[PDB]
Amino acid sequence: MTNMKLKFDLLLKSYHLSHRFVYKANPGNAGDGVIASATYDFFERNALTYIPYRDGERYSSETDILIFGGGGNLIEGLYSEGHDFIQNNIGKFHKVIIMPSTIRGYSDLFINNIDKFVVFCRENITFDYIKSLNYEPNKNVFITDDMAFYLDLNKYLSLKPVYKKQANCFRTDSENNHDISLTWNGDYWDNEFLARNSTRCMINFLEEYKVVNTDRLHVAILASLLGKEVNFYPNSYYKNEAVYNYSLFNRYPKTCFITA
Amino acid sequence: MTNMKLKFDLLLKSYHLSHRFVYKANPGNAGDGVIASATYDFFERNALTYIPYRDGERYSSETDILIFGGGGNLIEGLYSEGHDFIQNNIGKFHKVIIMPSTIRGYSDLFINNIDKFVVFCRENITFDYIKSLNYEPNKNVFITDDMAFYLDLNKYLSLKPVYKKQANCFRTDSENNHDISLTWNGDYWDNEFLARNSTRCMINFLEEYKVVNTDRLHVAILASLLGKEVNFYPNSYYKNEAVYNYSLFNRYPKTCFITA
């Protein structure tokens, strides 16, 4: 067990003694379903009970903590859904805990809510950014692996043998390409069964290949967990590269990052 | 057990004594994954062993039978993938068994291969069409339910409670619409784990709704198996309407077909 992982368990268990968890899964593609699956595995393994966020329900501004699911939606100039959800609901809760996330911009949101945010960063670029906004390391800003590294992998495996050479899993926007991230895409991941079975699908697909080529973070993560030979390609805002440098480098020697 | 269902079991078991099964799952959307899941359930429940079709492998023109998975791909003027697969591979096998399917046109294919085809029709329009091509009922043309009615439903259920009113699952081509059929879409369904877990996803989604509105056949079928209130809408070539009249009318009184 890594030092950041043990710290993460004890920390969330410490919050659970004091406040009850109101959990909102991050919406998005099937990669975001992998984060939710692993988050549900994390809650069950640490005996952490939660109530799912219900719009219109009244929560306690003193004893309820919003657990905002991990992901990379908080990117100014790209997505505004996660930013709008937090800003419209920050007043309802005592604290807002952002599960391990990639954050870019939205400096006004984090400076003006520093007293309510507890930010978990899944790579060094987000960690240095948040701490540069005067967040205090080990008090209201932390760094640790993306949730998907917590995936209880053995209950998702099909154990079907490898018989195909290369899988191409590239973003459809810009050969035999299978963008398996874009299968289920939306605000689905508050259903733990749908999240886990969607994650089984992605894993079932990858299990049968020896080599995986992708620019999709959680395809790369899943294939790395599977011990596959992984060729990971970059995207904008250093999103892929930063997670690779923090979590995949050296820890998974069969996964390499192709810069050019 | 329905009379057509019992006939179907004994018939395929009879073929299995004489020849070995080479199975090709129908490619397509997640509806076609439901057909494959149910076909795998059907094989396991009847102790029917098979070998998956492998392109480039040599099969016996005397003792191997191609089992072509059910579906609605054989529609002239719409799709040609299933037609090309059968025509290019019909010479390799002793017989070609078409699992319960909707067929439109391609009269040249069925007239010129009448001595090798055993056609299972999943509604009355296909059955009357094939038999009009001089196929002999109960010898080389049969009628029975779509494979999805064979789905071993209880191993797919999440048992999550109902808490949402209406689900809209309409074809994206032409409100809160979720075209869950277009999640996994391709030649995936020869993997039984991927087929079953994709089917779990669709079922997980539908379980939480009380009413389902759709023009997607296997969404309507799945929701009917779930005992939901189902509003089923038509499409072209009488594809939805014909399956409804044969399999869903009266047998599932909470599913109704909206003509206009």
Strand arrangement, sheet containing A141-143: A50-52, A20-24, A64-68, A95-101, A117-121, A141-143
The residue behind tokens 């005996």 is: A47
Picking from A178, A244, A252, A172, the residue whose alpha carbon sits closest to that of residue A208 is A178
Same domain, A21 and A144: yes
Enumerate residues 6+ apart whose C-beta is below 8 A from A244: A220, A232, A255, A257
Do A53 and A102 fall into the same domain? yes
Q: Which residue of B has its CA nearest to A199?
A: B197
Looking at beta carbons, which residues of chain B come within 8 Å of A188? 205
Of A148, A176, A209, which residue constitutes the final position of a domain?
A148
Contact A180, B30 (CB under 8 A): no
Query: Residues B90, B196: one domain?
Result: no
Task: Identify the CATH number of the domain in which residue B110 sits.
Answer: 3.40.50
- Judging contacts by C-beta atoms under 8 Å, the chain A residues touching residue B202 are none
Please enumerate residues of A whose Cβ is less than 8 A from a Cβ of B.
158, 160, 178, 183-184, 186, 188, 191, 193-194, 197-198, 200-201, 204-205, 208
Vertex A153: Cα angle to A148 and A156 (nearest 5): 110
Residues of B in contact with A204 (CB under 8 A): 191, 193-194, 197
In a domain, residue A129? The reply is: yes
Amino acid at residue number B214:
T
Q: What is the 3-state secondary structure (H, E, C) of B185-238?
A: CECCCCCHHHHHHHHHHHHHHHHCEEEEEECCHHHHHHHHHCCCEEEECCCHHH
> How far apart (Å, rounded) are the C-alpha atoms in residues B121 and B128?
9
Query: Do the beta carbons of residue A2 and residue A145 sit within 8 Å?
Result: yes
On whether both A144 and A47 belong to a single domain, the answer is yes
CB contact under 8 Å between A197 and B193, yes or no, is: no
User: Which pair of tokens denotes residue B71?
Assistant: 């579906």
Report d(CA B156, CA B201) in Å as an integer: 9
Backbone angles phi, psi at A115, to 5 degrees: -80, -10
A-chain residues near B191 (CB < 8 A) = 158, 160, 204-205, 208
Question: How far is B66 from chain A, CA to nearest CA, in Å?
Answer: 22
Alpha helices (H) in chain A, listed in sequence order: 3-18, 30-45, 81-89, 107-112, 124-132, 192-207, 217-225, 239-243
Separation CA B242–CA B254 (nearest Å): 18
Q: Do B201 and A198 touch (CB under 8 A)?
A: yes
d(CA A219, CA A222): 5
- Residue for token pair 């306690």: A60
Residue B175 domain boundaries: 157-257
Do B12 and B155 meet the contact criterion of CB atoms below 8 Å apart? Answer: no
Query: Cβ separation of A194 and B205 shorter than 8 Å?
Result: yes
Residue A207 tokens read as: 């299990």
Rounded to whole angstroms, the Cα distance separating A232 from A53 reads: 34
d(CA B117, CA B94): 9
3-state secondary structure of B248: helix
**Domain boundary, last residue among A121, A148, A175:** A148
Angle at which helix A217-225 crosses helix A192-207, to 10 degrees, equals: 70
Q: Which of A148, A178, A207 is the last residue of a domain?
A: A148
What is the side-by-side strand order in the sheet with A229-232?
A: A164-169, A209-214, A229-232, A255-257
Taking the C-alpha atoms of residue B234 and residue B240, their distance in angstroms, rounded to an integer, is 5
Instruction: Classify residue A222: in a domain, yes or no.
Output: yes
A207 occurs within a structural domain: yes
d(CA A243, CA A126): 10
Question: B158 to chain A: nearest residue by CA?
Answer: A193
Nearest to A201 among B184, B205, B208 (CB): B184
What would the two tokens of residue B236 be?
A: 């072209």
Residue A154: inside a domain, yes or no?
no
DSSP designation for B19: S
Taking an 8 Å cut-off on Cβ atoms, the answer to whether B191 and A197 are in contact is no
Tokens of B51: 């070998």
Q: Is there a contact between A191 and B208 if contact means CB atoms under 8 Å apart? A: yes
One-letter identity of residue A101: S
Per DSSP, the three-state class of A7 is: helix
A64 forms beta bridges with A20
Provide the β-strand partners of residue A186.
A28
Place of tokens 């219900």: A54
In a domain, A238, yes or no: yes
Looking at the fold, whether A139 and A197 belong to one and the same domain comes out as no
Same domain, residue pair A220 and A141: no
Tokens of A202: 């992605």
The answer to whether A101 and A120 are in contact (CB under 8 A) is yes
> What is the least distance, in Å, from the CA of B111 to any CA of chain A?
35
Cβ contacts (< 8 Å) between A193 and chain B: which residues? 158, 160, 200, 204
Could you tell me the end-to-end alpha-carbon distance of chain B, in angstroms, rounded to an integer?
Answer: 34
In angstroms, the separation between the Cα of residue A199 and the nearest Cα of chain B is 9
- How many angstroms separate the CA atoms of B188 and B209, rounded? 28
Q: Which residues pair with B117 in a beta bridge?
A: B96
- Verify that A82 and A175 share a domain, yes or no: no
Number of structural domains, chain B?
2
Q: Please say whether the beta carbons of A75 and A122 come within 8 A.
A: no
| Residues B17 and B120 both lie in one domain | yes
Token pair in block for residue B251: 């047998």
Give the technique used to solve this structure: X-ray
Put simply, the answer to whether B204 touches A194 (Cβ < 8 Å) is yes
**Is B186 in Cβ contact with A204 (below 8 Å)?**
no
Alpha-carbon distance of B61 to B90, in angstroms, equals 9
Q: Is A63 helix (H, G, I), strand (E, B) or coil?
A: coil
SS3 A247: helix
Question: What's at B163, amino acid-wise?
Answer: Y
Per the CB < 8 Å rule, is B184 touching A204?
A: no
Q: Is B138 left (phi over 0), alpha (psi -120 to 50) or beta?
A: left
CA-wise closest residue to A209 among A219, A195, A199: A219
A184 contact residues in B (CB cutoff 8 A): 183, 201
State the residue for tokens 């595995």: A41
**Shared domain check, B97 and B144:** yes
CA distance linking residue A9 with residue A206, whole number of Å: 29
Residues A46 and A44: their CA atoms lie apart, in Å, by 5
Contact yes or no for B188 and A205 at CB 8 A: yes
Q: State the Cα angle at B230 between B224 and B233, rounded to 5°.
A: 115
Amino acid identity for residue A189 in this structure: W
Nearest Cβ partner of A204 from B186, B191, B208?
Answer: B191
CB atoms A198 and B193 under 8 Å: no
Q: Give the residue on B whose Cα is nearest the Cα of A202.
A: B194
Instruction: Tell me the shortest Cα–Cα distance from B185 to chain A, in angstroms.
Output: 8
Q: Tell me the residue ranges of DSSP E strands in B27-126.
A: 50-52, 64-68, 95-101, 117-121
For chain A, how many residues are written? Answer: 260
How many angstroms separate the CA atoms of B26 and B8, rounded?
Answer: 19
Distance in angstroms (rounded) separating the CA atoms of residues B231 and B244 = 11
Say if residue B107 is in the same domain as residue B183: no
Rounded CA gap, B256 and A168, in Å? 42
Any alpha helices (H) in A46-191, and if so which ranges?
81-89, 107-112, 124-132
Q: B217 CB contacts (<8 Å, ≥6 apart)?
A: B31, B72, B146, B239, B240, B243
**In whole angstroms, what is the distance from residue B137 CA to residue B7 CA?**
13
Residue A258 burial by Cβ neighbours in a 10 Å radius (0-12, 13-18, 19+): exposed
Asked whether residue B30 falls in the same domain as residue B121, the answer is yes
Query: Is residue A191 in some structural domain?
Result: yes
Contact state of B197 with A193 under an 8 Å Cβ cutoff: no
- Burial class (CB within 10 angstroms; exposed 0-12, middle 13-18, buried 19+) of B248: buried
The span from the first CA to the last CA of chain A, in angstroms, equals: 34
Contact indicator for B126, B242 with CB cutoff of 8 Å? yes
Q: Do residues A142 and A167 share a domain?
A: no
A25 within 8 A of A36, measured Cβ to Cβ: yes
Question: A134: exposed, middle or buried (C-beta count within 10 Å: 0-12, 13-18, 19+)?
Answer: exposed
Count other C-beta atoms under 10 Å from residue A155's C-beta.
10
Residues in A closer than 8 angstroms to B194, CB to CB, are 158, 201, 204-205
